[PDB]
Design a protein around this ligand. Structure first.
Ligand SMILES: COc1cc(Cn2nnc3c2CCc2c(-c4ccc(F)cc4C)cc(Cn4ccn(C)c4=N)cc2-3)cc(OC)c1
Length: 296
């Protein structure tokens, strides 16, 4: 690929924590330690609006399938569901007893999954705003939660060193250094897992076997988002503690590009759902989001 910097998105006043593209490709959402969500045009980086209400910093944000809703996870121990077009808080999800660190809608978007420093994973009904299930998932803070393609499985990761797969309907576990990030692949067959020993691994969760290992980035302290890029060449994309965006060939595991420009840890990256566009976001020496575009 030839990702090149097209726009820098300034406005957050503390570290950015997460960036996500809306499923319809129109919007980028960012969350920050400054307690704010900001919405940006996905193709031109144009600032659209600020969404406020959380009492403390926000760690994560995630879109509903129809791109109409956002859920945010906050240090104020709540999640908030937002109407993106109005900016209004629709529901506040209360139940966690410590910082909420990660969140996601299921593909149907009738459920939200959250992970918290309270070491639990919670499953929430979007329509009633009530907690359906509290999973005693881990023995250290939960670093990531992700639904598979039909919402039947949740993958979770933790500083306890474990990655677990949960049956959504029952909340029961199906399968078991800190594991700092996990997510299902777009076909739902693989799980990409980061560990705080500077290593990403692609797992066949059916076989429970590691198929690929990606290194060259720096990751020993922070939970850094990673992604499958599928709109063009099949890459793995991650931030890094050396302030760069790393792109690997998924099959050969070779580094194909390093994106330079940020001035602090690249804590989050995201991949546009239909175009060859990457968003990246950095910690508080930088506080900006960058939009990069590739011809393939
Ligand atoms: C996760 O549990 C932990 C974490 C840590 C330390 N730490 N490491 N990385 C991150 C952190 C904390 C801060 C952090 C944040 C964050 C959160 C709130 C906020 F206002 C602003 C920021 C930048 C965000 C991510 C990225 N991000 C957000 C959601 N997801 C899924 C992720 N990848 C990462 C971090 C220490 C620990 O015990 C020693 C246990």
């Amino acid at each position: 690929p030839n990702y090149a910097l097209k726009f820098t998105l300034a406005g957050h006043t503390k570290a950015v924590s997460s960036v996500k593209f809306s499923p319809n490709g129109e919007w980028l959402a960012s969350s920050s330690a400054d307690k704010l969500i900001k919405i940006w045009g996905a193709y031109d980086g144009k600032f659209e609006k600020t969404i406020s209400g959380h009492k403390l910093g926000i760690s994560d944000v995630a879109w509903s399938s129809d791109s109409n809703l956002l859920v945010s996870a906050s240090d104020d121990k709540t999640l908030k569901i937002w109407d993106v077009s109005s900016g209004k808080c629709l529901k506040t999800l209360k139940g966690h007893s410590n910082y909420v660190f990660c969140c996601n809608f299921n593909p149907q978007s009738n459920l939200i999954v959250s992970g918290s420093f309270d070491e639990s994973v919670r499953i929430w009904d979007v329509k009633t705003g009530k907690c359906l299930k509290t999973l005693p998932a881990h023995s250290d803070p939960v670093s990531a939660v992700h639904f598979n393609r039909d919402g039947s499985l949740i993958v979770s990761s933790s500083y306890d060193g474990l990655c677990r797969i949960w049956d959504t309907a029952s909340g029961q576990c199906l399968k078991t250094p800190p594991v700092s990030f996990v997510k299902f692949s777009p076909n739902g067959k693989y799980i990409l897992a980061a560990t705080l020993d500077n290593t990403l691994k692609l797992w066949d969760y059916s076989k429970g076997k590691c198929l690929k290992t990606y290194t060259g980035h720096k990751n020993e302290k922070y939970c850094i988002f990673a992604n499958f890029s599928v709109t063009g060449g099949k890459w793995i994309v991650s931030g890094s503690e050396d302030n760069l965006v790393y792109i690997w060939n998924l099959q050969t595991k070779e580094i194909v590009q390093k994106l330079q420009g940020h001035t602090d840890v690249v804590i989050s990256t995201a991949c546009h759902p239909t175009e060859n566009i990457i968003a990246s976001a950095a910690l508080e020496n930088d506080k900006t989001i960058k939009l990069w575009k590739s011809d393939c």
